[PDB]
Structure formats: C-alpha cells, structure tokens
Amino acid sequence: TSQVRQNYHQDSEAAINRQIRLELYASYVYLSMSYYFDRDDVALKNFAKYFLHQSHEEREHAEKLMKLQNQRGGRIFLQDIQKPDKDDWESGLRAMEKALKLEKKVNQSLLELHKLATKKNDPHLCDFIETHYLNEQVKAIKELGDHVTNLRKMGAPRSGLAEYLFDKHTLG
Amino acid sequence: TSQVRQNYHQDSEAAINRQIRLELYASYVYLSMSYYFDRDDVALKNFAKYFLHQSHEEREHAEKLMKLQNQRGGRIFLQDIQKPDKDDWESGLRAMEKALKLEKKVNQSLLELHKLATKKNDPHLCDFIETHYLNEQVKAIKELGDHVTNLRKMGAPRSGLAEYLFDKHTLG
Amino acid sequence: TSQVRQNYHQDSEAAINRQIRLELYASYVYLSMSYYFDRDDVALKNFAKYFLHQSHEEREHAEKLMKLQNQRGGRIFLQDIQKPDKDDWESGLRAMEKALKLEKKVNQSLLELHKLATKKNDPHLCDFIETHYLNEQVKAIKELGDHVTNLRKMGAPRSGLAEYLFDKHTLG
Amino acid sequence: TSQVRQNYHQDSEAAINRQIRLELYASYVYLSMSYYFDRDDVALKNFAKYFLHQSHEEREHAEKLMKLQNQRGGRIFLQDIQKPDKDDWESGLRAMEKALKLEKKVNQSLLELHKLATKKNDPHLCDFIETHYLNEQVKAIKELGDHVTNLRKMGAPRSGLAEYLFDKHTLG
Ligand SMILES: [Fe+3]
Ligand SMILES: [Fe+3]
Ligand SMILES: [Fe+3]
Ligand SMILES: [Fe+3]
Ligand SMILES: [Mg+2]
Ligand SMILES: [Mg+2]
Ligand SMILES: [Mg+2]
Ligand SMILES: [Mg+2]
Structure with a gap:
C-alpha cells in the first residue's frame, strides 16, 4: 500500500483507470475524425484542425487523470484502446453529431465517477472532477x-x- | 449572534478553531526541523531552507482559517501551541518521514472538518476546504x-x- | 480510386496503415513508462519527463504517416491500440533497455516498409521514409x-x- | 566531354532536357489560365493570381533543371514551347481539373526520369529529383x-x- 494513500477507496482507483481509458478512446475518435476531413475527397481543413485540437485535449485529460492516480497513491493499469466506431464519418454535420454523442457519453461516465466519490466520502476527488472535468x-x-x-x-x-x-x- | 452569521453551525465554528491550532502547530514543527539542519553538526542548508519555507506556509494556512472564522461571523479562540515531539530530528530522511506523518495528520483533520461541514449542509465551508486545503x-x-x-x-x-x-x- | 492517386501500390497503402498503428503503440508504451516514473515509490521526474517527450514524439510520427496516406490518396484504417507488455517497468535502466528494443522494432518495420516501396518503385515513399524516419x-x-x-x-x-x-x- | 562530367549518362542528360521543356510548357499553360480569369467576362482575380503564381513557380522548376544540367556537365538544348491545349478554360473548376491533369503528367515524367537515374546508378540525380521535385x-x-x-x-x-x-x- 502506497505511503501517500489516504481516504482513497479501491473502487475509486478502479474507476479512475476506466476514465483514463475512455479519455484515450475519445482522443482516438477525434484523431480519426480529423484525418477524415484531410482526405482529398472531403478537404475541409478547419474541420480537420478543429477535431485534431480536440484529440490533443483529450490526451491531456487522460494524462491529468494518470497524474491524479499517482498523487493519491493508486496504480495505473492501461488497457487496449478500442478503434473508433467508424472509418468514414460522412460529413461535417454527422461528425459533429457523433462528437456531441461522445462528449455526453464521457460526461455521464464522469457523473458516475462523482457519484462514487461522493458515496466514498472522497471530497478531494469530487473537487478534482468538478474543477477540471465537469464544466x-x-x-x-x-x-x-x-x-x-x-x-x-x-x-x-x-x-x-x-x-x-x-x-x-x-x-x- | 454576529450580524454576518448565516448557515454557520457552532460545531463548525469550534472545528475551525481546532484547525487553526493544528496549522500553528505544524508551523512550529517545521520551524524546529529547519533550525535542526542549521546546526553546525548537521549543516544541510537546503533541508533547513525547505523546512523554513514549509513553516511560513503553515502560518499562512492558519491565517486564512482565522480570516474565514471572522468572514462567517465566528469568534477566534487561540490555545497554547504545543511544542514539537522532538528536539533532535536525527537525519534528513527521518525529518522527511515525520513531515509526511504530520501532513497526513493535518489532512485527516481537514477531511473530518469537511465531513462535519457536509453534515451541517454548509457548502460555503465545504468549498473553502476543497479550494484552499485539500489539494x-x-x-x-x-x-x-x-x-x-x-x-x-x-x-x-x-x-x-x-x-x-x-x-x-x-x-x- | 482517388483523383490524386499516382504510383501508389495497394501493398504500400496497407503497410502505411500498419506503421501508423505501430507508431501509436510506441506512443502508448512511452506514456506508460513516463507515469511509472511519476509513482511515489519510483519518483524519478526526469525519467518521467524524458519518456513523456518520447510519447508525444511518437504521436507526431503517427500523424505524419496519416498525412502521407491522405496525400497519396490512400485511406486510413485505424485499429485497436494494444496495451504495453508491462504495467511496471522495474527501473530506469530496465525501461531504457525496453525502449531500445522498441526503437529497434520500429526501425525494422520502417526498413521493411522501405524494402516494399523500393520493390514497388515508389521513390516518393522511399524519400519520405528516409527523410523523416530512418535517421x-x-x-x-x-x-x-x-x-x-x-x-x-x-x-x-x-x-x-x-x-x-x-x-x-x-x-x- | 566536360571536365566536370562524372557518372552522368547521355540518356539522363537527354531526359533532363525533355524535363526542362515540360516545365516551361507547364509555365505557359498556367500563364494562359491566369489571364483567362483576368478577362472582363470571367473576372475572378484570385483564380488569376493563383495561376500566375503557379506559372512563375514552373519557370523556377525549369531553371533549376538547367542549373543541374550544367552542374553535371550536360549541355542544355532548348526546343519550341507548344501552346496550351485551350484558349478558353471555361470555368474555375474546369481550369483546376486541367491543372490537376497537368501536374500528374509532370509527375509521371519525373517518375520515368527517376527510373532512368536508378537504372544508370546515378544516386546524385535520384536525390535531386526526390529532394526538389517529387514531394x-x-x-x-x-x-x-x-x-x-x-x-x-x-x-x-x-x-x-x-x-x-x-x-x-x-x-x-
Ligand atoms: Fe475528456
Ligand atoms: Fe497546513
Ligand atoms: Fe516513431
Ligand atoms: Fe514543375
Ligand atoms: Mg461538493
Ligand atoms: Mg469546487
Ligand atoms: Mg534512394
Ligand atoms: Mg534523399
């Protein structure tokens, strides 16, 4: 058990590892979307840039969660990153619609993570989620x-x- | 009853006075540690500087709780600041180990304080502790x-x- | 067939997609390594920094292959990114030994890619690998x-x- | 035989002269396209500017091949530059389509040149083509x-x- 660990429930530790994987998955989805818009037969450069920016931000979200895991004395366990649902995202509008669904999926995961932190009386973890993720x-x-x-x-x-x-x- | 007081329980008021005392004690522990490393027979100037900086920061933690007590219409009651557990801190490693134990002790006090504030439905006080102390x-x-x-x-x-x-x- | 496609064999296209996956895998290995060194029981911050920088570099390697795929009129097919072989990288030296082995593995794959491009008489792709990857x-x-x-x-x-x-x- | 000539086959010399002619022809096509867009009954100033830019760049490409010919000790032989295929380029889209066709034609010629340089074991000429032309x-x-x-x-x-x-x- 880590010399730093304090008021950090095993379930929270496990939930943080699930969130890391989801953030990395979101990054991968947005990467795929970006390069779709870079195709010569789609060629919407600012859609591509928009989605690549989102990709890079998702990676930061993952990294900050990995930092948190180590700060609280949990142990990171990484998993396969699943490939995105599509290869061809169809249009600017359909990409944006899929992005909206992804962000709501990620938000729901974070709300479940906050419910668990609340149940385990972990105010530091609640604060972390509120400050850095929910808004x-x-x-x-x-x-x-x-x-x-x-x-x-x-x-x-x-x-x-x-x-x-x-x-x-x-x-x- | 202070003209400013609203939604501030007497138990929260008393717990803040206990926390002030603990912050002042942590300040004093670190002061003692600092001047141990300044001894001619120990002579580790950057250990001394590290601990003196922590001492000054704990005093700031104490003052901000005093400011909070007055903000909420509570009344400050100061107590004797207990002398640290040791005069001689043995080595840089042993001092760091004792500092770790101390910070975990102060952290446990803040978590109990947050539990009380949650129990008394005092979201302003919950936010104060999360924002300025827990991280x-x-x-x-x-x-x-x-x-x-x-x-x-x-x-x-x-x-x-x-x-x-x-x-x-x-x-x- | 893409309006931009010229002298770009289907085998080269497929090999670029394999290389993209391997670069993303190397990014993930280096991410893992980095956060191992951030653990409170490992605590080598410059090892962590060094491996994080390598992780970000690998992602750029991947993105540039994705750009090339689109430039040549090929189509990106992303796959699951497999988790690294270890969760715990044992020590600074052992991590460095594993990174050496990984870089040799990536290099051999790039050399096979160049062998294929040569066999398909694709001087653009040869030049691309030489200019951006081999050195x-x-x-x-x-x-x-x-x-x-x-x-x-x-x-x-x-x-x-x-x-x-x-x-x-x-x-x- | 030039005092500088070394490892430079007469076939390569001849193919560089053909390439110079093609680059100058591309310059002429783009000049034509440019001033079509300058007509009062077409009046697309940025199409005009885009094509005049390309015209000027094709001339630079020609000049760099003339410099190469002399560097390697070949002798430049210029030929008639044929007028472009159209006088009226119909529309912005049709001009872009014709420009795509032309660039692929120029690309195919450079790839045939690279095949010849590879067969005559002329790595300097191979490098020149890859470095300055293919990408x-x-x-x-x-x-x-x-x-x-x-x-x-x-x-x-x-x-x-x-x-x-x-x-x-x-x-x-
Ligand atoms: Fe995210
Ligand atoms: Fe403190
Ligand atoms: Fe790489
Ligand atoms: Fe040209
Ligand atoms: Mg709260
Ligand atoms: Mg807050
Ligand atoms: Mg070569
Ligand atoms: Mg080269």
Whole structure:
C-alpha cells in the first residue's frame, strides 16, 4: 500500500483507470475524425484542425487523470484502446453529431465517477472532477450543440455550400 | 449572534478553531526541523531552507482559517501551541518521514472538518476546504513521499553522501 | 480510386496503415513508462519527463504517416491500440533497455516498409521514409544505447544512487 | 566531354532536357489560365493570381533543371514551347481539373526520369529529383484535388455563386 494513500477507496482507483481509458478512446475518435476531413475527397481543413485540437485535449485529460492516480497513491493499469466506431464519418454535420454523442457519453461516465466519490466520502476527488472535468464537458456539449444547430439551419448535410461556409466562417 | 452569521453551525465554528491550532502547530514543527539542519553538526542548508519555507506556509494556512472564522461571523479562540515531539530530528530522511506523518495528520483533520461541514449542509465551508486545503495536502504528501523514496534508494540514512547530494540536487 | 492517386501500390497503402498503428503503440508504451516514473515509490521526474517527450514524439510520427496516406490518396484504417507488455517497468535502466528494443522494432518495420516501396518503385515513399524516419530511429537507438551504457557503468539497477544521479545529470 | 562530367549518362542528360521543356510548357499553360480569369467576362482575380503564381513557380522548376544540367556537365538544348491545349478554360473548376491533369503528367515524367537515374546508378540525380521535385508534385496534386472537391461540393460550375465564394474564401 502506497505511503501517500489516504481516504482513497479501491473502487475509486478502479474507476479512475476506466476514465483514463475512455479519455484515450475519445482522443482516438477525434484523431480519426480529423484525418477524415484531410482526405482529398472531403478537404475541409478547419474541420480537420478543429477535431485534431480536440484529440490533443483529450490526451491531456487522460494524462491529468494518470497524474491524479499517482498523487493519491493508486496504480495505473492501461488497457487496449478500442478503434473508433467508424472509418468514414460522412460529413461535417454527422461528425459533429457523433462528437456531441461522445462528449455526453464521457460526461455521464464522469457523473458516475462523482457519484462514487461522493458515496466514498472522497471530497478531494469530487473537487478534482468538478474543477477540471465537469464544466469542460458542459462547455464542449454546448459548443457542439451550437455547431450542429448552425449546420442544420444552413442546409447541411445536403448543401455542400453549407459545410464549406461553416468551415470558413465558424471553424476558421 | 454576529450580524454576518448565516448557515454557520457552532460545531463548525469550534472545528475551525481546532484547525487553526493544528496549522500553528505544524508551523512550529517545521520551524524546529529547519533550525535542526542549521546546526553546525548537521549543516544541510537546503533541508533547513525547505523546512523554513514549509513553516511560513503553515502560518499562512492558519491565517486564512482565522480570516474565514471572522468572514462567517465566528469568534477566534487561540490555545497554547504545543511544542514539537522532538528536539533532535536525527537525519534528513527521518525529518522527511515525520513531515509526511504530520501532513497526513493535518489532512485527516481537514477531511473530518469537511465531513462535519457536509453534515451541517454548509457548502460555503465545504468549498473553502476543497479550494484552499485539500489539494494542497495531496501535493505536499506526494512530494514528501517522493523525497522519502529518493533518500532511501540513495542509501540513507547510513550513507552520508546520500543526504549531502539530495540536499544539493533535489532541495537546492 | 482517388483523383490524386499516382504510383501508389495497394501493398504500400496497407503497410502505411500498419506503421501508423505501430507508431501509436510506441506512443502508448512511452506514456506508460513516463507515469511509472511519476509513482511515489519510483519518483524519478526526469525519467518521467524524458519518456513523456518520447510519447508525444511518437504521436507526431503517427500523424505524419496519416498525412502521407491522405496525400497519396490512400485511406486510413485505424485499429485497436494494444496495451504495453508491462504495467511496471522495474527501473530506469530496465525501461531504457525496453525502449531500445522498441526503437529497434520500429526501425525494422520502417526498413521493411522501405524494402516494399523500393520493390514497388515508389521513390516518393522511399524519400519520405528516409527523410523523416530512418535517421530519427538511428539517433534514438544511439542515444538509448548511450544511456544504457552509462547506467550500467554507474552500477544500476542495484545502486539506487546511480539512477538518482543519472536522472539529475543526464536527463535533467 | 566536360571536365566536370562524372557518372552522368547521355540518356539522363537527354531526359533532363525533355524535363526542362515540360516545365516551361507547364509555365505557359498556367500563364494562359491566369489571364483567362483576368478577362472582363470571367473576372475572378484570385483564380488569376493563383495561376500566375503557379506559372512563375514552373519557370523556377525549369531553371533549376538547367542549373543541374550544367552542374553535371550536360549541355542544355532548348526546343519550341507548344501552346496550351485551350484558349478558353471555361470555368474555375474546369481550369483546376486541367491543372490537376497537368501536374500528374509532370509527375509521371519525373517518375520515368527517376527510373532512368536508378537504372544508370546515378544516386546524385535520384536525390535531386526526390529532394526538389517529387514531394512538390505530391503536394500540388493534393492541393488541386482539394480545390476540385470543394468547387464540386459547392455546386460548381453551375452555381456562379460557388466560384465567386471560392475565389474569395479559399484563393484570396
Ligand atoms: Fe475528456
Ligand atoms: Fe497546513
Ligand atoms: Fe516513431
Ligand atoms: Fe514543375
Ligand atoms: Mg461538493
Ligand atoms: Mg469546487
Ligand atoms: Mg534512394
Ligand atoms: Mg534523399
């Protein structure tokens, strides 16, 4: 048992390892999305940049959780990172819709993690989740919502004009 | 009853006065440790500096709790500050081990304080402890554990080269 | 068939996708290693830093292959990223020995990729591997050899002093 | 026989002269395309600018091959530069499609040149082609591919709004 460990439940430790894996998975999804938009037959450069930025941020989310595990005296156990659900993400709008679903999935996982920390009376872990993760998810969800709404109102996915102009004027 | 007091239980008020006393005691422990390393027969200047810095920080932790007590309309009651458990702290490794035990002790007090504040439905006080104290303790405990690990692996306390080089390369 | 595709064999495309997976795997190994050295019972922060930098580099290696795949009109197919072979990397020296073995493994894969590109008379792809990958591996392999040699000469992994001082003076 | 000539086959010398002619021809095609877009009845200034830039770059490509010919001790023999295939390039999309076709034609010639240099064991000439020509062609092809995709998706060449907006937002 770690010399630093204090008020850190075995279940919380295990839940943090699950969250790490999910953050790395989210990173991988966004990587896949990015390079879809880099294809010569899709060629929406600012969609690509937008998704690659998200990829890199997900990796930071994972790293901070790995730091937390070690700070609290848990032990990191890494797992296979599952490949994304799609190879072809279809359109700007469909990608954004899939991203919104991903962020809500990740948010639900974090809310389950907070429920467990609350049950185990771990206020440091509650604070960690609240400070560094929950508002990030609320902001990401709201932004993705806004993006999906605009793309739909502009006439996407059907109007190819719509994705081109959104790429330029919102994501540029 | 103070004109400012709202949702602040008498038990929380008393627990904050206990915490103030404990922060002042931790300050005094670290002061004693610092001046041990300043002795001509110990002479590890960066151990001394490390512990003196911790002493000053604990005094700040004490003052912020005093500020909080007054903010919430409680009344400060100071007690004798107990002398540290030792006069002679033996070695840099033993002082680091005692510092780790002390920080875990203060952390357990803050967790009990948070449990009480949760019980009394005092979210302002919960937030105060999480925001200013809990992560500070986690970082301190992790750092002290890291230091103990290194000193032991280096071959302390028998190898006096170990303490000299750690003083120079880690604490310098 | 992609409107940009020219002189780009289906076997080369498939081999690039295999290489992308291997670069992402190496990124994950180095991530694992990094956070091992961040543990409170290992506590070698420059080893952690060194392996984290290598992890981020590997991800860039992957992204550049993904870019090349799209430039040549191939199609990216991502796969599960397998977890590293170990959870616990034992020591600074043993981690460095495993990194050396990993870099040799990546290098052999790049040499097979070049053999294939040569056989398919793809000078662009040959140039790409030579310019961006082959010398980078040779440098990495030489540096890891140098590190292994020094740690061994210093007395690692039995001497914990050796790892401490190598962390400070070579990696810091 | 030039006092500088070494390992430079007469067939390679001849193929460099053919390449110079093709680069100058590409320069002329792009010049033609540029001033089509300058017409008062076409009036797409950023298409004009884009194609004039390419024209000037093709001339640089020609000059660097003339320099190479002299460096290796070959003798430059210039030929008539044939007029481009069209006088009227129809539209922004059709001009981009023709430019993609032209760049692939130039690329195929460079690959045939590299095959010849490889057969005559001329690594210097192989390196020259890879370093200065092959990746430049791959980037040009990918960029033209990207432009064609976007113009098509925006609804060109039917939608005159599409070419106007593309001229402003992508080529401006
Ligand atoms: Fe995340
Ligand atoms: Fe304190
Ligand atoms: Fe690599
Ligand atoms: Fe050219
Ligand atoms: Mg709370
Ligand atoms: Mg908070
Ligand atoms: Mg070669
Ligand atoms: Mg080369």
